[model samples]
Target: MLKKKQLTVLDLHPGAGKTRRVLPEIVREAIKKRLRTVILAPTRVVAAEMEEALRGLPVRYMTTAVNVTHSGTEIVDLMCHATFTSRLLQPIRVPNYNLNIMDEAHFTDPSSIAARGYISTRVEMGEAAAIFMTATPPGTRDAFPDSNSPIMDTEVEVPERAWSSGFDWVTDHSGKTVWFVPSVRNGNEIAACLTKAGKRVIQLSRKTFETEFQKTKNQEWDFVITTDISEMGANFKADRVIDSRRCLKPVILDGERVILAGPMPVTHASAAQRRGRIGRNPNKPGDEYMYGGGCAETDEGHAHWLEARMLLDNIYLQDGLIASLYRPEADKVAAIEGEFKLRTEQRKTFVELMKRGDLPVWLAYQVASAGITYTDRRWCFDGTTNNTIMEDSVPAEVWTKYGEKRVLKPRWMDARVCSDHAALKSFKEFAAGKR
Candidate 1:
């Protein structure tokens, strides 16, 4: 891939020699120029892959937080995006790498700490210009917006994509498969069904994801059920993928079904990522089965946009830095986002309270943040009553005043979105005074 600009952003396909060909060549270029270089991968697993790909090259695979090991002389210093961010604000006089290659740049989203941190390093570290590459790009484009895919020597396989209306297709399928479920509960459901049917399956959730994933790499199970946690970062050379793109999270309140745990399709990006899983192994045949019927794919981005905005809000809530807040306050404010924003009047009151220095400094953040998004005290991620089908199924749309005056009655509430919005028992008492 040729450099497009001072900070080039390349849109490349997944597993298409990005780690193998492009990175090694860049390191070679760095060595030729007698310059320091840093390559930031999206996840730890991906970082390890980069290390393996760059064998015998001058690279220090960073395992710690700050890459203090980078002595300004290595051909390539490898670390995850988060690590690069965490070490971003260190003494600017530290070794400044000339060429910074960011693989899977989309993961450092505009709404994340990684993105903000990268922006800081871009300017702070002189000549720290970058090459941002990923299969998925934002809704818009950057430098070289209109370009073709890159050429590579790796074998690319196009897998078969099929559709199944019911999950009976899963119970019928034998072993050597990776099924992508919507939530952990969904993974559990399939895990139970597969277990009952004598299928050796491993359900990988966020808690035990790494351990289970490492286990998966060692032995072959009949089925490996995964959630969004495994969507990116690592590769599973999976034989086939059963992506039940639908997210069905049951919202139970007072013996009533406010939102039924039924079919709700995931975001378009998620479906694309699921398809990416199977085609990784060109050496063998692979197929992806989708649970076809649900809400349109375009509908999920709004909620994601909101979540990103909220995360940015928390960062500003910090002292114009990464949000390393007291655990209780962070949890409380997070809960408050979906709560107050649900109602037009309450949302206005809350923002104004923080904006005008009315709410105590201890309880809120005054005017702050230096990011691109305009923060006039009044900020983003404010919950809209426009309520996507996903938001309506949420248990606490208007948090504090939940079930008070506003709420479409149980049967009347429609359009389930995203994951299960469940209440944490006794969490209130824990977060109340701690904040």
Candidate 2:
């Protein structure tokens, strides 16, 4: 357990200067120490906001895949939450990269495996300090035990579930309306409706998300039709939000394809963050019912029931992530190429290591922490013959033309996101804030 002194929470609200005012001050002090730092934003949209917030600072926006470390010139590195986890699992050395700041900390969920392993394997292991910034800290404070609210007079407990009860508010609003419509088709439809009403509009999907997201930042459109990706980050500075809870038709949770009963329910913490996005113009009075909400209903306890399933999905979802971090890209790539004789020898080397005691003792504990089970086996890395637009199963086992020798390798499949090629390309593009 982390002692109270080891952790600090800037339990502040959105637009509360946690990122704009306070975090920069902390970074400046770190500069005096030449303290290497990595700031994590949970999503790309949020990274956009941070990009503006830390504008003049010595910041390098990157992901772990960039494989670069902090330099004297650029001491602060910013990335999405996934990259940070990948970096932590790289056993990304610490104290070398010391100061850790988690913006919107609640979404990282302190009890989460990535956070737990990071605390154990990196922070405590290397005498590092961390600051967690969240408008919504854990209502239970497992991550901030014994800490009081940052503000005494203001309420800091989890916000109540304020599901938007109706969509009647949508047609009534005007002026830079930011609509969170998840369905691309629906987003297009929504945009057309607003456009026909003589309102300027743009709709985003995997196809148009990159450019459309950027347009929302610099350009003026009456309606920005976007998805849940906009929920966490980017102050739309609009008068109101069309909180349409539509989501992608299929989401692969913990390695299996699943469908939602309703619009994906959001955590109160996220809902609060989105609320902050509204009424942000400061000059203009905010418009009609800030969040125009829910359409169809579901029996799944209204995440629109999406939240109910996400609870179980994120649990072991950490395992595949953890294991993949240990498994390298070269390792992943080598497993795919066919007709390599030398790779058989290479496979022999690792295959033996896979045996009980042949593996390094140091590697064992980390692997154990990765949490293996039948469910997680979905990260299969076996052999395959395929690739159109998407490819999942790779070359695992095959037969030889040379004297009947057999080639075998473990299966590797991305069960969570269905990331074959296109998904990765889209996410990487979005992770860079729709660049």
Using TM-score, give the best candidate's number: 1
User: Which pairs of residues clash in candidate 1, taking residues 3 or more apart in a chain or in different chains?
Assistant: 339-399, 389-415, 390-417
Q: Which sections of candidate 1 miss by over 4 Å?
A: 1-5, 64-72, 89-97, 108-117, 120-128, 140-168, 247-264, 293-435
TM value for model 1: 0.58
True-vs-predicted CA distance for residue 184, candidate 2, Å: 3.6
- The residue-by-residue lDDT of candidate 2 on 1-435, one tens digit each, is 122225566776555678878887888787778777878887666677777767678888885323334455787788876556444333234334567787766552211224433432344444666787766654421211111112111112211122233443454555566666545545655566556667778766544555667777777787777665555446665765545433433332442223332345444444454445565444555342243333221221221123111212222223332111111111211222222111223333322222322222112222233343212222122225231113344422222322232323223222222322444444223222222
Error of 1 at 349 (Å): 24
Candidate 2 yields a Cα-based lDDT of 0.45
Residues 1-435, candidate 1: write the lDDT tens digits.
Answer: 223226665656666766788888878877877766778776766766676777767787776533344555566678766556434322223355667777765552222333433333443434356676666544321211211222111212211122234445555655467777666655676677668777788878645675688888788688888876676655775556666666543332332113344446555445555556655545544344343433343332223233333333333222343323112112212223321121233333334333332221112221121121112211211224442223344633222222222322222222222233331222121112111
